[PDB]
Amino acid sequence: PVDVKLEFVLYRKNVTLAELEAMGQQQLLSLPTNAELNVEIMANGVLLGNGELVQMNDTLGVEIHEWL
Amino acid sequence: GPVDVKLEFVLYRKNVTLAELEAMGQQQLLSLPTNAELNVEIMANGVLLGNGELVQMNDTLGVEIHEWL
Ligand SMILES: [Ca+2]
Ligand SMILES: [Ca+2]
């Protein structure tokens, strides 16, 4: 099979084209509180699961709270 | 509609095989590559707009922009 496009998504939302332009004027973007508690694992547009950011000994990790 | 944009802040993305995805699904704690956090990608309708670095701010996480495309 062909490869699938896997993403670990820290935050997602719908915004308007105007808000998208506004965002580009910023140098530091705040994410909503607890975005780190809802990391979404997605592939080819399908939600696979969600989890939480963890600082491990040498990297960041994602602790899975649910595989769908 | 056309005014609507799907915005994503992506910590890590990769083209993976079905077998690799299967193996991932067996895990409870997934390690990300070293410094994935240095390349948080900002996507709009699946297209890369910019990238930055994950920062712990006072009340939330933030993304420090390093490049807008
Ligand atoms: Ca926790
Ligand atoms: Ca935590």
Author numbering:
A (entry chain B): 2 to 69
B (entry chain A): 1 to 69
Provide the publication's sentences verbatim:
Proteomic analyses have identified the major components of the sorting platform for the Salmonella typhimurium SPI-1 injectisome: the AAA+ ATPase InvC, its regulator OrgB and the proteins SpaO and OrgA4.
Preliminary bioinformatic analyses suggested the presence of two putative SPOA domains in the carboxy-terminal half of SpaO, which we denote SPOA1 and SPOA2. It should be noted that SpaO(1–219) does not complement a full genomic deletion of spaO, demonstrating that SPOA2 is also necessary for T3SS function. Indeed, SPOA1,2 is sufficient to co-affinity purify OrgB–InvC.
